[PDB]
Ligand binder design. Structure first.
Ligand SMILES: FC(F)O[C@@H](Cl)C(F)(F)F
Ligand SMILES: FC(F)O[C@@H](Cl)C(F)(F)F
Lengths: 168, 168, 168, 168, 168
């Protein structure tokens, strides 16, 4: 590429992976959201929480794709694997699954930053710090807070309703 | 009738039945609503939910009557039977009764649409699709959602209060 | 499902397929859009055209998922295959690919409608007619119009720039 | 200096160089802009593009000078060499020259960041990341996009007019 | 001091103590607030209640310091001891600790007023009555009210969530 400068093939490849990870995460949150919209689950606030996260992850992928092009790298898309479950259990089960997923994304970001540091790619490092690293930390904190409140509330049926009504 | 075109006597008759069904449903919801206004039941949100549905069903009947005249059919009214119960039990009992009633109306709509299809009456089919079929599906979904939440909440007294307060 | 009425397993399954088709189409348009954002392609209007279509297809999938739940069917997600190309050639090549894709979606909608008709499922038929069938026809017409204008313009470089500048 | 803390003489010196580089770049863009204002060149949009870049580079130098003082370093100004050409040829020639110049500035920024990293000077690293690194990447991307469009348009006279009219 | 009139060394010294008491109380409420911000405690309303009290106590200290100077006394600051606990247990445990702390401050105010009365220092007495005595009484009443409601609510997990959601 005529514009490419200080952008390693290793980072370019890792950015394409991370795009796949973010799209997979978006797809997982789509499945989570619609599960809580089932007539036999029916927790609207939980559905909305996860549908909003699907949008956020999709937007993350799009930001990574924009940055890939800005640096002169080439987007390469792969098959998106379906989410790990078809049914997600209770709000607690779902929130546990979500925090596992976010920590997996956070670790991928951290690995990419480490790669960027090893390749002396300060633009990549700043890009990650500006748009992803703090967003992941804040989100993981919020999920941790939710998990604690859900757990405190488990008369499990009543607790799950009250959390959806009064927190989400 | 000078305006009547492609409107079978079978459909005309079935439209008069459906009007009776919708009026009966309106009357049932009137009884449900006022039961929840009793001083010894006293669930205002439940009362309002059912009184609003009484209005909606009445409006459905009126739309069917307007369409009957637009097509050149003749309204024929019959006795309206009283609702199936005088007392409706808990919110859960009442919501179960309501979903049974809505499914009965939905089936009558579907039968009428099938009749219209067999009689090649596209105006009837569109009329049903525009004003009734989707409205029934959405309402039945909402009642299903409510039933699930009520069931999750059954410390039955506390649950019933919380549902009325925080959902209805 | 407590709400399920007149909703065949065949339609439920076909709705899940169609969701996969719409998500695949969204992913294809994401790849198309970002290809035209490459520094060595650099056609902003083409990029925006396809990114908007990615959003529209995603929204279609979401509407199908909402309807699935409203009817008491169960969402089942599958792997999403990657788009058919990594690089999309010229605006003309891309628009040809897009119209092929839209016709494939349109045919899937038509097949689903035929299935609904055979299963006497008027709610499905109306749902498709209200939110998808006319939208597909209008979009395919617009792409046809674009294809004709692109073709007329092929001094191919100059033509492609002018189309992006003055139409897109 | 009474305020100086963790600010190496190597960085201070490199900041003075970079100021000279940014001022030289501002001067180059001044020459580019006024060349396109010649009555025998007469491409107003190209002139404006380069005059705006002259302002941006001057502002970059001023930000570096402000930071130098904030850290307790001492500005040292050197002769500013005249631009590499007196006449800049076509829009394409000029845009090629501009991207070469921007890549040279970007490399100087990257070298300075590497120096800051080796000297453990996190304030310098953040300063560069906040105000320069992303700005260079975005600008180089935009020039790459322009180069591609100019090249596609080369009936060279007609192409150059159309680019100036419809992009710049 | 040129302005000092009717201001005993005993009162001046006791005012410096009280400043230390108010600052210690501010520090205690800072620790309480951030404990309830822990991901494994996660009671936002409780955190906010205590952070607001930290601000109020700090402001009390500042008012005492302003009055000290107005009277011609001399501020003398001492080490601020860390709060009595690192972890504060439940909302109930924390509210009990808070009311103990407020009663300790109230007693210090009362002692200071008694000192002022014995020293015939009416300005001090009015100062205390205007800005502190009623504020302490109102706050202690509110905490008592909260303690009663928390106690009534102890299904301890559910109670603690509901108090935070619906009172704080
Ligand atoms: F197909 C993609 F563009 O969107 C993905 Cl994330 C999907 F999950 F919504 F399917
Ligand atoms: F003389 C400088 F202040 O401005 C430089 Cl940058 C010039 F290029 F405009 F001359």
């Amino acid at each position: 590429s005529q514009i490419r400068q200080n952008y390693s093939t290793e980072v370019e490849a890792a950015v394409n992976r991370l795009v796949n990870l973010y799209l997979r995460a978006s797809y997982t949150y789509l499945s989570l959201g619609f599960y809580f919209d089932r007539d036999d689950v029916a927790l609207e606030g939980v559905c909305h929480f996860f549908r909003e996260l699907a949008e956020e992850k999709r937007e993350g992928a799009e930001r990574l794709l924009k940055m890939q092009n800005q640096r002169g790298g080439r987007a390469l898309f792969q098959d998106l694997q379906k989410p790990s479950q078809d049914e997600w259990g209770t709000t607690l089960d779902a929130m546990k699954a979500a925090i596992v997923l976010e920590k997996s994304l956070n670790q991928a970001l951290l690995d990419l930053h480490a790669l960027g540091s090893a390749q002396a790619d300060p633009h990549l490092c700043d890009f990650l710090e500006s748009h992803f690293l703090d967003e992941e930390v804040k989100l993981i904190k919020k999920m941790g807070d939710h998990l604690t409140n859900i757990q405190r509330l488990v008369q499990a049926g009543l607790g799950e309703y009250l959390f959806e009504r009064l927190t989400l």
